[PDB]
Amino acid sequence: METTVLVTFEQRLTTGDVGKLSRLIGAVIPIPYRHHLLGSSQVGLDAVVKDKTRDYSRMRARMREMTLTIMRRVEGNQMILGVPTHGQCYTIRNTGPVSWEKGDVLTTLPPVFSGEVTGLVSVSDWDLVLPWIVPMALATEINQRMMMLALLSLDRSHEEVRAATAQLRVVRYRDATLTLRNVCISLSMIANLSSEVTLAYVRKLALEDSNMLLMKCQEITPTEELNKLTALFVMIRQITDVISEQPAFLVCDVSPDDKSALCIYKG
Amino acid sequence: ETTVLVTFEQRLTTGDVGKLSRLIGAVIPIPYRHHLLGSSQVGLDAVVKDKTRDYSRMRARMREMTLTIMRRVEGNQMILGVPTHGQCYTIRNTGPVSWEKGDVLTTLPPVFSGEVTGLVSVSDWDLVLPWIVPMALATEINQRMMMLALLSLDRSHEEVRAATAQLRVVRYRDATLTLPEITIDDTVLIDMRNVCISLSMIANLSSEVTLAYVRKLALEDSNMLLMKCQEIYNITPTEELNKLTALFVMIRQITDVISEQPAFLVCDVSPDDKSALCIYK
Amino acid sequence: HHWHRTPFSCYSAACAHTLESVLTLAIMHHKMSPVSIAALSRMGLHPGFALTVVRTDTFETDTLLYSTKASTAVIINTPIVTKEDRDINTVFHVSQNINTVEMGLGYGATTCTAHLRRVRSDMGSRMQDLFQVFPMHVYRNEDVDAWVRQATGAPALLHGQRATCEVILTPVSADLEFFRYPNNPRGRSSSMLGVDPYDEDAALATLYDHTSPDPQTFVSTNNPWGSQRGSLGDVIYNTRNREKLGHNPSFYSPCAQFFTTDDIINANKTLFKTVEEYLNRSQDCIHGETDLQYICVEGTNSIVEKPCRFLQEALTQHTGTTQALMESQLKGTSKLGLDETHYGNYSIGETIPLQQSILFN
Amino acid sequence: TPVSADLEFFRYPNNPRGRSSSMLGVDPYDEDAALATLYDHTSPDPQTF
Amino acid sequence: LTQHTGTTQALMESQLKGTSKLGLDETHYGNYSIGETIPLQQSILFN
Amino acid sequence: TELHPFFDFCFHTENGQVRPLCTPRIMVGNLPEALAPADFHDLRAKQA
Amino acid sequence: NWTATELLPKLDVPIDLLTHIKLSVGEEMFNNFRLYYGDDPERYNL
Amino acid sequence: SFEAIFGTYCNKIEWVTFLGTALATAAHAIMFHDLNKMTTGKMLFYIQVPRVATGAGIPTSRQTTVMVSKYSEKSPITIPFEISAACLTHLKETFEDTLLDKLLNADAVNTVLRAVKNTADAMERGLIDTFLRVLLRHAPPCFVLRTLMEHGTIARRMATRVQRANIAQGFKSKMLATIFLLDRSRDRGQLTRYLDMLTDCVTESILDNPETYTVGGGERLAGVIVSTHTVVQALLNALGGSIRRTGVKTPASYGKFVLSKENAVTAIAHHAIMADFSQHADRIQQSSQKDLPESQFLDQRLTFTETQMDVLKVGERLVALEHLRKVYKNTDVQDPLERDVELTFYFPVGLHVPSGRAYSTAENKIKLVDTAENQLPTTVYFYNKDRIPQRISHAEALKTLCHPAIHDAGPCLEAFAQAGPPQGDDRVRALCRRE
Amino acid sequence: RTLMEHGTIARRMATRVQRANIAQGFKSKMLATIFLLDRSRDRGQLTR
Amino acid sequence: DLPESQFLDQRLTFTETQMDVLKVGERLVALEHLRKVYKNTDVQDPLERDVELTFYFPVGLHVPSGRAYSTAENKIKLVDTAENQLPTTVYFYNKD
Amino acid sequence: SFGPMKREVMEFDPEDPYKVSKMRKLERSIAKGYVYGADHQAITARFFVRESLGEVEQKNLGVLMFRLDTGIEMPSTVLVSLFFLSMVAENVSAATKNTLAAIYGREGEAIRTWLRDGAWRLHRVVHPLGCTNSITPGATCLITCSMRGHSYNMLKTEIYPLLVPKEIYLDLDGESTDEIRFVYFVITYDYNSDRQGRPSAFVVVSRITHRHTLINVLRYRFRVSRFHFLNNSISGYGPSTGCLGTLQRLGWFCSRDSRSGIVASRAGQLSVVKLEKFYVDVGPLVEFA
């Protein structure tokens, strides 16, 4: 019926491992790029989870490039996938740590190994590590905790600041508790430079005030002047690239045992 | 309606329809969205020949246009299927950017490096198509319009022109385009205010951890971003959650000032790099 | 913590007086700053070390390939059709699911390197700029950073892609022996065929136990600065250490196939699965349409690699130190084989006579 | 210039401009890359480097 | 094509003393010979 | 010991611990004669 | 299941070797083999 | 004026077929419509060992018996082929009397037909390509196979360290002496010797049909040498007296793998197949181990045709040739036999000769000047792809020297702190507190 | 000869590496293939 | 496919003439004296063709002394004169 | 021969986008009698709704449903109508607020006054779920809620409209034309004293498609809240608030069909705006300020 992506099992999938793939019939699949044949080494997110110096946001910058795809059926030597048509309903499988509820917007995130390190049907270093289809309001929440832990990561030498971090990685949502760098440089370039460059621009604009809002906005070298504002706006572009989490689903109703949920596919 | 049959209504040539026969899959905007339209409305050219003619009014105008895809060009009938939100469509390249598979495309008014004959100036009317740029060139070319409008606030009359020429040759992927001799217009000014207000609130919400993060990092680390940005405690995390979140309200808005509408998201790019399967209007 | 370290005094205690020790102690007072090496080699003054430039050379080559009669059964099926809808150009993808069950007992096929078509590499003497390889690493001082990046590394091709990498080595090291015979540029030959077919601790004893002897010389280490774990060859040219560190993965590095600890521990699986690994994971090629040398992105050919990952030796080409030696090599129509040493000089002969063979063809 | 290396330039055949300006390896149609090969010396040199 | 060339007649007699070949570039201290690319001296001596 | 030319490395038995020291060889002659020999330094002096 | 090989019938074929049959499993021309010297009583346990 | 549009000379495509090509004498192509339902295919082999003991007091082994399962590896293919919806539009719409119905009806039909015909062409050439890539990825190089034939024969167990050291020496010597073979000037007889060496050091497989792939005269082939353009024509021009063009019988159809009534219930019951099941079960109700006369891969009712092939004779073993650029010309995909092979070179620069033990051979040739530029071997010269001398030094090598990853020590601190003192008692003494 | 040896193997725009090898092929083939009658000649080499 | 294309069906009445042949590459190739159609004409045979070739060579080219040397020293033994030590002239034979 | 004759069969299935959906539905409608829910390009979902939530939506049909993230773990997901959160917003007249507070409030609701007015709107408790058709009154109300597409009777007999209440609509009714008309949904806060304000809700229709040109016509309306948004930025240092406004796509309709109406319910009637051909189409959140 729909779009088709076949996955050629370069590794030998034992019938018991097929028994685990035949349980994940609904589950999402991160595909690197839309093509009809892909290897099992392509299919999945393990090629993203792999570097000595690889940061959470950089993986999220990679996964945002990866096309979401949905498992259709596992026929032995092959995995059949469907790139989901936008706007249609899809039975995706709740392989995240969070129970879904009727009406919620679901966002793909890379799985975090903080207290919930997980693998799959692995043989020869390839498992099928599966992205946390997490609710959208918690997806922004998880992002904010990761940056604030990293903004406080330099001041480990204070125990009180370390006790501020000790509360911080405790993430608690409906029926679920889980534990959790240039992006924080990007946070700090906006925090410091907007403090200094706006003062010559508030006092000039505050005379004429159409929406009547510049009045309490005041209450709140031209080459180097633009050089600040260039490296102001481009760092604002860099953080907004890794903030707007591009929502992926809308669960209409949840199948019982919370394994699956019919989800109309959005974005 | 979706399928838009188009009247040419001008005196076209064989050399006209031969060009569109190879251009099947191009992006044409229509304002009215009937099944039957004429080429006075069909096409983007009929508003880029205005008399003021700055990027400030052309960009805000054509977000009320409705984009279509060129189909079935034989003789005098133009089938323009209005795309639906979220189906896969292929698009022929209208502007020389290779579109770099996997990213979001947008709508750029007109090249505005001169006035390009989009098809052929037929009866002194050409059919000019929008540029469809991969949203990085779109945001950057909209950034510099406000960069150089903030510049003209605190310059007298020449260090604008000595610094616009520094910033107008935008060397992007396959393209070196030109800022259109930046005219200070009020659609920029109403939104340059809210940018200056958005810069103000981030200074308010910067709660001395988000502030000092680079200035604490330069003492420990030696990074390329860290050295170029040299020239350029509290036990209240729950409050830092809300201040960072309210800071994220601003930066998702001040980017949205200079960003454009997300549009055709690349499925695949041909090795010819001309026809590009794309989803998501 | 002293500036003057021990070999100053332990040189001066046996130094030879009268106008040469007086000045050579002041030449031993040359700084080891990066900008000192910069100005030093800039004025041609040779710094206190000797480096070894390594280089790959890509040869586009006809490979003949015998295959025995009815070796492997290509089991196939009916090529089935699916239809993707791209709304004005619909695409019928068509597929044939095929397996290949193995041949017999032995290998029923063999590849033979037969005829060089081209040399994609130029055999050039470009340098691998670590300012571009590791783009993140700069100095803590703005001024020194700008001085270094204007000292070096702030569209054109005629012989195919340029190829290079780098190793630092002590200036004692025997050009008299070690460079005459083809080796590992790490200094200590780490060949996995020498070590036991699975023993990881024995393989680590080959690589980094320098109290264990070197194979194939028994002089246990030639470059201590670039053979040890955490040596200078190791912290830069291993991809494990290079990936602890911040680098660009795009660049090809002929050092990596020597200095990668883990990628040569993984070539310690059972002498025939060794060569099956050599056939399976030979997907580290060089991209075709690039000026310099960037790795392949998505394969498409299991190329035959070099004897490294298999024999772990790099060749040497003809290497005359002075043009006196080089013009006495190529005086008239002569070979590139003479090993000749002038007192402070050397001519390292080429192993595979490529300067003879490609001239012949 | 009298110092010019016969080793690095004169025993093999080369462009007597000193900088090799052969237009068979360059981006062919690109006149800007062509002038980068010919007259831009901040650009590297073909055939000798 | 950088032709057959001698800086000094010493080098030139070293090149063509007798029926010998040509391309011996053979540098002296300030004196240098340049070897011809095409053996035109040999081919015009021959044919 | 000789991990790096420009830097010298050895252990130091402090108060209960063999801590390493990565102390930079500041001059070119801080290398041993085992690595930078006497004739090499003299010959380099001639080059200067 | 190697009993399914050694107990059921087979197919008389000409074989080939690079080196040696007992080195084929120690130098591992193939992995997941079975080697046995005394005639196995396990195949008699059905 | 005129333009003279002359005859559009539509060059018709050259057809291929997998069984007609010479690679199918190494292949054995079998249709099996539940290959999309297998896990794999894992042929088990029972080998009675060649058994011998002897002597008095010689350590006599007991009766070794080997069983060995070989697996199947996939490589499935998908090409696309596109039809324009504007091309399908007139086949759907089909106007009344209009140039479109007269010509572009049949032209949209022919656009479809051309897509399917180039699709079948690409399916056959993708089958060519995948079988060639399975051969290449499961074909170790010739010097490797030569060394394994030579020094690995007598070694019974897992190989000894000394033995595999000589195996490494054998790979080294055979690779250096035996690289770029046709590029190296070799005699006709010596190339015949090396092809004898190839076809002897390779191992002729299990499946062997007396009916197919025999030359007219009952003379059966033994495989094929596949190659590219220049190497094929150089082999032909070398061995043209021995290479005789002959029509060779080839199967004109595919083999079949069938699932029995029994065997489907077997695959349902415990998710496996034993091939040739009823041919086992008749042996069950007979005396058990009577070996089967027609295997599932050997009972093949293959139709047959002939194709003109260039066979030759090496090792008294008839070997076909293949010029596979006949199927790879004008195709996008490069030949997998046209193979780039990179090789890594090293050389020293700046490397101080130890002057105490020094000397000068070739001082008869060399007259260098007594300057320390000459006395320190500082720069080093070389030839490029062509004979262009190329000078290298620390001055050109400044791009790797002055970088701060040299003058950092963080990872080096970490490795030296982790890898502690080795247990040499000189070190154990030298453990000290001074700095 | 250079074109038959390398060029039509690819079909796209000629690679920055490949056309450089084409230039080198012009050099080598021209310097070995200029004045065939005047250079040394076997009857076999002439027929080849 | 058009079985009669207009270039393809150029029917030509046939005759014979004694010509040269060669069996090269199993592709039969004829020869032609073109001199015997350019005999005693003003227009020369265009296959007879001047082929210009550019030749460069240096003169007065100083060599740095610290890397300078002298091979062929068994062949040469100059007068120790700086007229010999600098290049000033450059010698080369003519056509003859 | 073989290959191309098989590919004609996979080619010549023309005139339909797949002819896989339409043909294979018929071979199961011949099998099972005429099947409903199959000639339906729009997209629905059946939801378990209690009797205390069953009202309004039951009687008058075609109206929004909203999920709650109520901060209590056991009933954490309460269905909310667009009529229902009129007892939260500041826009709604207190009579109009207490009209529908007395419809819902009969002994099964008024927690949801106290855990929406009290447990404030963070504009993340509400989720635009969709619009209704075909309520199932029984032991449990079972609402078929449409997701993408129109709300309509089965048998395609009547397009169910969108029942927008009047108070939430006319304060951001768009301009007058006859085109297609997108329905957006806007939550605006007046940050005055009580940590969120009285979180004001809006159903806004506009011809404008683009994002920042749409929030600019909100930058006209909401200066009273925007100047108060700037106020608590300096009225509280350390404490901050969040978003000023929150925009999301909710659907569209045909804009000649925009006409007023009324629902005829318990506790009096309620003046609404009836948007007839309402294609439900939920969009993403646009947090702005």
Numbering used by the authors:
A (entry chain a): 1 to 180, 194 to 233, 265 to 311
B (entry chain W): 2 to 233, 262 to 310
C (entry chain m): 968 to 1121, 1146 to 1352
D (entry chain n): 1161 to 1209
E (entry chain n): 1306 to 1352
F (entry chain m): 533 to 580
G (entry chain E): 4 to 49
H (entry chain m): 50 to 484
Authors' text:
The structural components within an asymmetric unit encompass 1/5 of a penton capsomer, 2.5 hexon capsomers (1 P hexon, 1 C hexon, and 1/2 of an E hexon), 5 and 1/3 triplexes/pM32 dimers (Ta, Tb, Tc, Td, Te, and 1/3 Tf). To overcome the aforementioned problem of weakened densities and limited resolutions, we have used a sub-particle reconstruction strategy to obtain structures of the MCMV capsid and its associated pM32 at near atomic resolutions and also built atomic models for tegument protein pM32 and all capsid proteins. In total, we have built atomic models of 55 unique conformers, including 16 MCP, 16 SCP, 5 Tri1, 5 Tri2A, 5 Tri2B and 8 pM32nt, amounting to over 27,000 amino acid residues. As detailed below, the atomic models of pM32 of MCMV and pUL32 of HCMV differ, though those for their capsid proteins are similar, with root-mean-square deviation (RMSD) distances between corresponding capsid protein models ranging from 1.95 to 3.36Å (2.47 Å for penton MCP, 2.09 Å for hexon MCP, 1.95 Å for SCP, 3.36 Å for Tri1, 2.05 Å for Tri2A, and 2.10 Å for Tri2B). All bound pM32s are dimerized in MCMV and can be classified into two types, either pM32-a (cyan) or pM32-b (orange-red), based on their relative locations on the capsid. The subunits of pM32nt dimers cluster on each triplex and lean against two neighboring MCPs. pM32nt-a and pM32nt-b are similar in structure (the magnitude of RMSD is 1.20 Å) and form a “Λ”-shape configuration. Careful comparison of the atomic model of pM32 dimer and the corresponding pUL32 subunits in HCMV (for example, pM32 and pUL32 dimer from triplex Te regions) reveals that 17 residues in the pM32-pM32 interface are within 3 Å of each other, as opposed to only 4 residues at the pUL32-pUL32 interface. The existence of 13 additional residues at the molecular interface of the pM32 dimer indicates a stronger and more rigid pM32-pM32 association than between pUL32-pUL32, which is congruent with the pairwise presence/absence of pM32 subunits on MCMV capsid.
